[PDB]
């Protein structure tokens, strides 16, 4: 066939899209215990019975958790069993033979879902498919219980029957590269921006201030963010797996936590710094020197290191459940599993405390600005909008994640992994958003223009 380019029309990818891959035992929309790629264990409400059937199917004590290999094997077994189920049946086979490969895959999909007998139950629909009346069968299949229980999937299967093409599944592959280029743009923006900032502060002598000494730290954290964390994360998501080993996996995770913590805590330090610089400038200039500021930076990076490399490299962050053990054992797995202790501690240190301090400090500024030696002009509005951006961007980017990060560790399976990763990346873009917020000074402007010779 000479076909080796992405997305070949078949039943396996279609079912992968319609079902999804979940290694731990879950409940479908109906309520039956399902595992892997749409593999029905049992109709019994008891989880122990499901574990029994699973252990019998696999051939070992799985504790409700199977590996990728076993999941794929079960998937293929169920597909082949569905096909043989079609061929054995007297109502399914005459229809199956009189279908193109695509519609054949649609039928195999239906049988894979609701079983041989169930699909054979569809007398009128199969009769219509047999006489090649695709649209009538499309209308008819939408009047079943199957369309009411799982409408999103039923629509795709029905559309596949009607059109005879992979239109309902072809669009799904576009979003992959579609978001890949977005990730690329993110990396480019972060790296370029932060490198520009660091270069600006390091090269020019007029940008050698304490505030800028903190900005340097923030830009460094965001730089290592855009160089190590974000690209490897993008590769991890796009390629579906991890090809660097457990050591580099946990090392990458360590870099992640370290950089995020250092970034946010540096934001906090900047907030406090500006508070003292604005409220009591004469004391701020005398007390806070460059050495003391560098000591502050060192302390922040130390605290960030204690909440990143220390617990992770020592495997203190590790969970105890079976899936976590399997992923830690698997060299190609780099999924993130933690206990309540590390999740809560890291969330409090990295985000929540700096959040509280920043809110309190900026509120102190906004409140103390109203009690100076002074008509509701435009300057106060502009300043309020400025701080609105400063706190607004940070909150909008990092709050939804650390909330989710604290909930997904309390009640199990309330937040889907997609949302977790997504919000984590919405946290990631803040690293790129920072150089646009903390570098708007005239000196920074002149530096930025002179650097690239605009």
């Amino acid at each position, epitope marked *: 066939d000479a076909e080796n380019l992405y997305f070949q029309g078949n039943i396996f990818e279609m079912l992968r899209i319609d079902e999804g891959l979940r290694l731990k035992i879950y409940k479908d929309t109906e309520g039956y215990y399902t595992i892997g790629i749409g593999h029905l264990l049992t109709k019994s409400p008891s989880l122990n019975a499901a574990k029994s059937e699973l252990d019998k199917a696999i051939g070992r004590n799985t504790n409700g958790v199977i590996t990728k290999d076993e999941a794929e094997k079960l998937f293929n077994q169920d597909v082949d069993a569905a096909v043989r189920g079609i061929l054995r049946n007297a109502k399914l086979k005459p229809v199956y033979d009189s279908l193109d490969a695509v519609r054949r895959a649609a039928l195999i999909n239906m049988v894979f879902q609701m079983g041989e007998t169930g699909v054979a139950g569809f007398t009128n629909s199969l009769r219509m498919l047999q006489q090649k009346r695709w649209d009538e069968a499309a209308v008819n299949l939408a009047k079943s219980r199957w369309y009411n229980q799982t409408p999103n999937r039923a629509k795709r299967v029905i559309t596949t029957f009607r059109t005879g093409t992979w239109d309902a599944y072809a669009a799904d592959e576009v979003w992959v590269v579609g978001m890949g280029i977005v990730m690329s743009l993110i990396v480019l923006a972060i790296v370029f921006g932060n490198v520009l900032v660091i270069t600006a502060i390091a090269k020019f002598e007029r940008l050698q201030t304490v505030t800028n000494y903190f900005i340097t730290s923030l830009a460094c954290a965001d730089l290592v963010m855009g160089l190590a964390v974000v690209p490897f994360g993008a590769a991890h998501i796009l390629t579906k797996t991890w090809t660097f080993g457990n050591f580099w996996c946990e090392f990458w995770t360590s870099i992640d936590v370290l950089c995020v913590t250092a970034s946010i805590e540096t934001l906090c330090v900047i907030a406090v710094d500006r508070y003292f*610089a604005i409220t009591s400038p004469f004391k701020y200039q005398s007390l806070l020197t460059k050495n003391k500021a560098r000591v502050i930076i060192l302390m922040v990076w130390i605290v960030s290191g204690l909440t990143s490399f220390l617990p992770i490299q020592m495997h203190w962050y590790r969970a105890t459940h079976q899936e976590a053990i399997n992923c830690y054992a698997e060299e190609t797995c780099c999924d993130f599993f933690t206990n309540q202790a590390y999740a809560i501690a890291s969330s409090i240190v990295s985000f929540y405390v700096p959040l509280v301090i920043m809110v309190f400090v900026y509120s102190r500024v906004f409140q103390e600005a109203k009690r*100076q030696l002074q008509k509701f002009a435009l*300057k106060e509005h502009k300043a309020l909008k400025t701080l609105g951006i400063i706190m607004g961007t940070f909150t909008l980017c990092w709050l939804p994640f650390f909330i989710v990060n604290i909930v997904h560790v309390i009640q199990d399976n309330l937040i889907r992994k997609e949302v977790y990763i997504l919000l984590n990346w919405i946290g990631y873009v803040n690293s790129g958003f920072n150089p646009l917020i903390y570098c708007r000074s005239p000196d920074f402007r002149i530096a930025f223009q002179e650097l690239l010779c605009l």
Partner: nanobody
Amino acid sequence: QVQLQESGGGLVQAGGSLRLSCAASGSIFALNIMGWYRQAPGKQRELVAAIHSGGTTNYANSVKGRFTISRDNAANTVYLQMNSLKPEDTAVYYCNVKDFGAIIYDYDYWGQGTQVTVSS
């Protein structure tokens, strides 16, 4: 887009007193540092005397005890009291406003500059 009106400078004998004054015409953020700098003949621009919007002040080590800065009620006008002048106080005095409108940094507003000559 604000203006700074300086007034008070001029010729003065050694040991005499002089009063500088800077009026800020325009909208300035409530948190600011309004002060005076100077340029001596052949020397860099040095800070003379700055006052914070919160009342607190700050002076150079060569003018402390001789110079004293204050400000008006809400007119945003700053008055610099210069007593016991010296020949090394002969310089070009600039009025200045440090505005913390963007919080992260500070916008500087400068004056036209006034000449002060002390008769040696």
